[PDB]
Structure formats: structure tokens, C-alpha cells
Amino acid sequence: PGGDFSDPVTSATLGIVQVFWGLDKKLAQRKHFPSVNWLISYSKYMRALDEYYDKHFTEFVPLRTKAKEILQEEEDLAEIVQLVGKASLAETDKITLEVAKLIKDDFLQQNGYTPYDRFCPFYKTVGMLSNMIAFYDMARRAVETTAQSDNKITWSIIREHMGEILYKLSSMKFKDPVKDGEAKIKADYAQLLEDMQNAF
Amino acid sequence: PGGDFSDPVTSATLGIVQVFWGLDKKLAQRKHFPSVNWLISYSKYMRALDEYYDKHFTEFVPLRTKAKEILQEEEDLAEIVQLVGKASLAETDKITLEVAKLIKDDFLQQNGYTPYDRFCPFYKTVGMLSNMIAFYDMARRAVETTAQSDNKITWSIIREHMGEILYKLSSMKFKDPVKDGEAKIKADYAQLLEDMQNAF
Amino acid sequence: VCLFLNLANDPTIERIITPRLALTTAEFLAYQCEKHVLVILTDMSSYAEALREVSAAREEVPGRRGFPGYMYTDLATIYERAGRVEGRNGSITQIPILTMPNDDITHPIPDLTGYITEGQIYVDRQLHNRQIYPPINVLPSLSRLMKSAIGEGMTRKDHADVSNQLYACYAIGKDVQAMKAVVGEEALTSDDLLYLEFLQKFERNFIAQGPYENRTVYETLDIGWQLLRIFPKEMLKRIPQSTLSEFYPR
Amino acid sequence: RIEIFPSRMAQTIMKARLKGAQTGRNLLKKKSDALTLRFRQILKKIIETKMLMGEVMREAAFSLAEAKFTAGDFSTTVIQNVNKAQVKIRAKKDNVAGVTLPVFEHYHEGTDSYELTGLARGGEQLAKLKRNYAKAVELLVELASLQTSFVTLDEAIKITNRRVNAIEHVIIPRIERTLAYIITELDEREREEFYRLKKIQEKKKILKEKSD
Amino acid sequence: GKLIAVIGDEDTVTGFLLGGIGELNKNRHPNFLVVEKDTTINEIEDTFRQFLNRDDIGIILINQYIAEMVRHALDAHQRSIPAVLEIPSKEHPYDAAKDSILR
Predict the structure, then answer these.
(1) Domain parsing of chain D, residue ranges
(2) Exposed (0-12), middle (13-18) or buried (19+): which is B122, by Cβ within 10 Å?
(3) Is C64 annotated as a binding residue?
């Protein structure tokens, strides 16, 4: 009642269940569906599933571990933005606040009534995740290696150079897997992995 | 740990008892022993003790009157430093923040597992307070009379000068009264009051 | 003085009949023997802890915050035995002293008292740790019928203006004392340096009294002018010039 | 947006955290007003000394016109013979409300590189051209002492007027609707205790109706 | 900083070098630049970068007639030091500075 998770039905349920997909109301005041709040939700089936993951999709376990650090450190710094301001951010933090906006709009958002997002198979889930994490890793390599010495990359030219690559990354939710082959789609991703390596 | 004055055991006790030695949690987490805070504690036995204090230690009642103002004018200025800082603080305001720092560190702090501060007799209590308020009385006089006199002491003159005296005031709690005579301790504290009047 | 003790080791039913005994005799001295009576009911928070005790002896369900539901009627049956009557020269005024727990005004003991009584007087911990006796801060304190009590035929005709001017100069002198720490003692003007010298003399000569100094209502106002004389006039804007000319020059 | 659990001691903790932020505005409203008061009188000292240098530089440029009338053209001897400076500046610090302002104070380490310039033609129109431009440098450094404190003041006003509006709009409206949640949740713990005690007093009455 | 720099004019800088503000250390640069009628705007922009990024340049004087040519350049400078002052010249006194726009 009232969206209060300190409820004797909810608090008695969370002492029993192992997974908890806590939906949020403010993620429905903007049309963000599915509205699972990624900060309070958890799943205790991680030690049981890594043996399955190290047998089928071996790259996935550090992918979701790095994606859980980007989504959490955005919340630590969006509290600074609403109080201090965007102008006092470092270059390792402005890259985090915009790859997370790429995560919440491309990866996490999924419109179930569209034919491309009514069902997302798990090769497409890891496929568009191994691209957006490595792009965050590559844009971190354009900051820490070029730390202070030369005229360095201050992230404003990554937006300008990769203006179609940022459209190549934000439109992978469109790569329809019903009528698009798995091998087709998989190839379409690794090609976008090749375009970022050439552009960086 | 909780229910400070809204607790039916504590809200019923304080209508009956005369002395309340409130142990604070912020002092106990920073390892200030004993953890009695001086703002919510009280004692209603001071009017009954003033006939005792006017026969045995007749100098004490003007001392603990002033010693509670210094501990209270510090907490008035404590919320100023936490907001704007120590930048534009006056010379009369900065002169309490070392004496009130000296009271909480040397007078109030006491280690009972130590062979000299397991019991402090009351001449040692009056003796080290009659010097730490006298240093406050001399230095306050040494500021307001030299004010508008073209060589106003900005109190950093005092801090480097009285470095031995501030070491003598900090080392008052060490004057072991088990193995140190009472009359020696009364002689050691009397020399600081003459060393203070000499160096001032 | 008619003194009624009731100790804490006395029966808790006798705490209920203690303000009923004290106000029965104060209705015999006032408007039956025609003398002006002051009733001082100290610890009115220990009365309603005895009212809560006998309310659980009669097997009643405790109301808001444990106190019974009829506590507004029960408190007002011992407050409203006050005031003057038409045909008799007696009068009876009450000062019911109570201790609000945790410095809370939303507690039912000082909230159901402020609904029926006519203005409050705060003893506060801020001035008490500062060693000021009595520690009565006059900024949240108020007497709702002080405009009737003072006057020309009652005390003297400058009481209405020296009370408004001492209160207005106290709010400014407390406001500029917050400017002394974040701006500096130098950068404040010559006006704000006069309010700070008023503040150290108001809380030491006017409020700070000592427990055996019996000041009359005339000795109070004469101290009230010695603290207003350190300002020049035309800063004393709440006092009219019809009363500023008689009492300022001395 | 609420923070913690209603427990009747969280109500007096959050009333103190509200008390810290209620006096955090009124302590920082006047700090942003003391900075604004100096900002509005430095700007008066700027514009008054932009019309004061409008006539000092008129006299000094006319004194150069008097010196070229007497002593030829010295606009190639003066420009070439620069080796060391005579009028330098040192940066002093001054503060209003705890915010330091960089200000400039000039000084003369005097050895004249143009001690002999002219000396057979001119020399009296010079060294009164030198006075009319050293007087302009003494003025223009006092104008530059008001330029470097001006632009560093509204840099420290925007970081204060944002911190005031971060308290009045984000921190205090989060506490005053946290405290509104403690009172509505502590009223429901009283009715649940009211329903459990009235349930027992209805059961104790029935057992006392059997034993009659 | 510790120096005063002037861009000025041909008649403006020779009045201020007589004031005693010019210093010549040929290792780095001279602290002034006489602008004639045949200097491009690209030369004024280069020496303006030299006076901003130097350590001892504390005050920069420039004529307002010259400052409109590099008006896009000094608005990018929004720091506290060095102070860019706009001074009058022959038949070009004063209209509006960048500092009074900041209001």
C-alpha cells in the first residue's frame, strides 16, 4: 500500500524469496519500462549461476559486474550534480554519467509491444552489453593514459568523432532477432566492435 | 544508546533524580573517556554545596562558572566553523577555541586504567582549572587592551610564545598524586601561575 | 503564603487532590475574603503523570501519547478557577509551572496548556549554560494580556514603549551577533557595533538578576532606560516622541 | 523522499537536522548578502574610475603631444631602450566574509632607463610626460585592484547562491516531508496499540460476565 | 604576477614605457607589442596568448580600438588574473567593456 516497501506483507516476503525485482514509481512517471529499480533490487542466484555462465557465455560475469559499478557510481555523482553542479566534474566522471545514460536508455529500457523488444534472447543481451562496456573501457583509455602531458582527450571530441558510433550503439535494440538471424545479429555487433577500435 | 528524554524509564527518572550524568554517543565513538557531555547533563546540588565551597576551596565557584561559559561559547562557534570555516573568526572568538580545546583534551579527558588518572583528588581538580581559566583571563585581557593600540596581538603571537606554558598546561594531568605529594602538586601548579604572569 | 507540599514518595492519588485543595482555599481567600491571590502550581507535568496513573486503575484505554482523553477537560478544571468577578474586590491569577519533555511543544502537556492559558514564559537551556539567572529568553516569551496590565494609572505611562523597544533592540542585537562570526568585527558598521554592546549589557543587567534582588516595577524600567540610552534617538523608532522627551535625558 | 525509520527518537533527531539546515540558510543568506554588498559598491568604484581614467589619459596623451612638439620624435629611442622595468606589482590578499580577493599594490625599484633622453632638445617636456604617465600607472593599478576582486567575487557568489538554493529546495524539502512521514506513521502505531487494548478489554468483560 | 604588459598603440605604449613598465628578458619575450596599421589580427591573437599564459604578467593594458579585433578572445578569459584593462586612445575613448557586461 502506498508504494511503501516497509510493509508487513513485503517485509515478510523478502525474508523468504531469493530474488527481488523492486519496481519503482518514479521510473513510471517517465515512461521507462521495465521499471525495475536497479539500486534496491537483488538476486541471490549468483553463486549458482556462474558455473552455468562459465560454460556457455564466458565473458558475461565481468560484464554485469562492471555494469553494476557504472550504474551505482552514477547515483553517487548525480547527487553531486543536483547540489554542486555539472561544471565541477572530472573527465573520468563525465564519461560515467553518459555511458550510464546509454545503459538506462538502450540496455535497460525495453518496449514490450514493439516486435524487436518483445523478446530479447540472451546472445543479444550479452551482445549489446559487451559493446557498451568496452566503449566505456576504451573511453577510459583515452583519459588515464593521456593524463596531463599532451593536449588530451576531454570527451568533447568523442561525441563529435563518434557521432554515428553513438548512433550505432544506441540502436542495437533494433536488431530484430525474430526475423534477423542470430549469426547475422552477432556479426552486426562484432562489426560495431571493429568500428570503435578504428575510431578510438 | 537511544531514547534520550523520550523514554518512559528516563522521562520518569529525571523527574525524581537531582544529578544526571548524560553519556553521549558522539563522544564515545571518538573515544572521549569519560563520555559525559556537558550540555544536557545537570546537577541541582550546587546551591547546597556553596556553603561547603566557600569554606574549603573558596576560589572554585568563579572558576566553574567561567569554565561552563567557555565550553558553551565553543559550541556556539562550533556550528560556524562547520558552515563557513575558521577564516573570518575574531580574536576574542579564536581565543576560546584553544582554551576550550585545552579543557576537553586535558581537563575533561581522563584515563582510569592509568596509574595517575585513576583518581584525581579535588586539589588537583581545582589546581589545574585555576590555571587554565587564569590563562584565559590573562590572554583575554592581553587582547582587548591592546585593541586599537597599533600592535594588537592576533593571538598567533601568543601561541608560539607560550609553547612551554601550553605544554605546562597540557601536562597538568600527569602530576601523579599517588607518588607525588599533595604539597608538591600545589607547588608545581603555583609556579605555572607565576610563569604565566611573567611571560604575559 | 499557604504552602502545599506533595513529595514524590507520597501517594499518587494525593497529587490529584493537591491542586484541588490549593484552589479551593484560593477561592476562599479571593472573592470570599477579598484579597488578591497568586497560585503557583509547580510541576504540572507531574500532575498529569498521576492522572495517567489512576486512569489505568479504572481500566481505561490510554489515549494520545499514553495520556487520557479527558485531559483537556481535567487541566481546564484547575486553570479556569482564575480571573476577577463583578461584585467582589478579590482576584486570582495562576502561574502553572510545567516541564516539557525533550524541549517539545507538540507534547500534550504544553499543547493543551497553551490552548487555555494566555501566554507563556520560556526557561531555556541556552541561557542557563551561559550562567544567566534567571534564564528566561524574552524572544519566544509572550504575555497576551500585558497590554491591559501596564499603563499610566497602573505602573507608569512609558511601560508600553520601553517594552517594545527593548524587545526590538534584542532581536536586532541577536541578529547582528550572527553577523559577527561570518563577516567580521571590522566590516560591520557603527550601528551594528552598538547593538553588540547592548546585547552584553541586556543579558547581564536586565535579565541577569540574582536570586535575592527584589526589583520593583520602577527599578525595572529605570534599568530599561539605561540600556536604551546607549543608543541615540531616531534609532528608538518604536517609542513615540511624546514619551521619548521625558525619560531619555538623564 | 524519506530517509529512515519512524521510532520517536528519529523525530527528535530529524528535528535537530532540520534545526541545522534552518540556521544554515540564515547564516549563509547574510554571507551571500555581505558578498553582494561589496559587489554593488566595487561596481560603483569601477564605473567612477572608468570616468576618472577618461580624463587622466586625456591629459597624459596631450602631454605626449606637447613633448613631440619640442623634442623631435622619440618614439624609436623609447621603444628600443627597454632593458629592465621600474614600476612592478606585488599581489596582496584581502578578504570579505572569509573569501580572499587578489589585489595589487605597486612599488618602485627606481633606476631610470630614460634618465638621459633628449637632454639637449626637450628634457623639460619629458620628465613631466614621465610624471603624467607614472600617475596614470598609479591610478590604473588601483583600477586593476578593483578588477581582480570584482571577477573573483561573483565567482564566489554563484557558489554561495547555489548552496543556499540547494538547502532551501533540496535538503529542507526532503527533511520537512521526512518529518511529515514520522508523524503519520507514529499515529498508526498508536491505533494498533489502541485496537489491541480495546480487544482485551472486550474479552475481559465477557469472562467477567460468566463468573457472576 | 609581477609585471605590467601593454598592447596599446604606437603612441600609447611609448607613453607607458616612459612610465616604467617595460622589461626585456630576451630569453622568453618582450612584455609589449607595438601594433601598427599593417599587423594582422592573427598577430594580435598570438601575443595575447603569450601574456595570459605567462607567470609574471599581472596586469594587461590594451586599447579598446585594438580589443574589438580580439573581442572573441578576451571573453574566453574568465579568470581572476591577469586583469585585462581597456584604455582610451586617439578619438576612440570608451563605449562598453567586457567587465561591465558581467553584471
Answers:
(1) 9-210
(2) exposed
(3) no
